[PDB]
Amino acid sequence: TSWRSEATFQFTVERFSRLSESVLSPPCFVRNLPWKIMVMPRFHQKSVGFFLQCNAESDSTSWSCHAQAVLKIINYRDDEKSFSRRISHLFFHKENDWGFSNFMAWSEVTDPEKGFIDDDKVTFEVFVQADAPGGSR
To answer: Where do the segments described as Interaction with p53/TP53, MDM2 and EBNA1 lie?
Structure first.
C-alpha cells in the first residue's frame, strides 16, 4: 500500500491562531517514501507557510522523486472556496521539501468569517503524485 503512486492526506493544526512555530504531520507513504505536511507562520504582514516534505529523515543521498501536488487549505463551509495551489518538483536529499512561504495570508485564514478556521482548527490537505524508476515498457 506504500507503493502507490498517489494519495491524498490531511493534517489538522489545532490552536492555530497561537501557532508561533513550525509543526509537522505524521507521514503518508507514496512510492515507498514518507511524505509530510509542514506548516508555520512566516514574517507586519504575516503569512501561512505550507510545504510538502519528502523522506527528510533518511540518511540516503541517492533517492529522488519527481512529484506534482495540490497543496490545499480546506474551507469547512464552502468547499468551492477551499484555497489551493499546485507545485511540481524533484524531491531529493538537498531539496526534500517544497511549497509556499507565502501560501496564504494569516489574517485571511484566521478570519472566523472566511470559513478556513473552525474552533481555532485549520485543516491542510495535500494530493501528491510521484513518479518512480521502471522499465521503458
So the answer is: 1-133
Structure-determination approach: X-ray
Whole-angstrom distance, CA of residue 25 vs CA of residue 23: 7
Selection from 67, 58, 49 nearest residue 103 by Cα: 49
Three cell numbers written together for 128: 501528491
Beta carbons within 8 Å of 113's beta carbon, 6+ residues apart: none
CATH topology for 1-137 is: 2.60.210
Resolution number, Å: 2.3
For 4-20, b/e burial (b = at least 16 CB within 10 A) is: eeebebebebeebeebe
- The residues spanned by each domain of the chain are 1-137
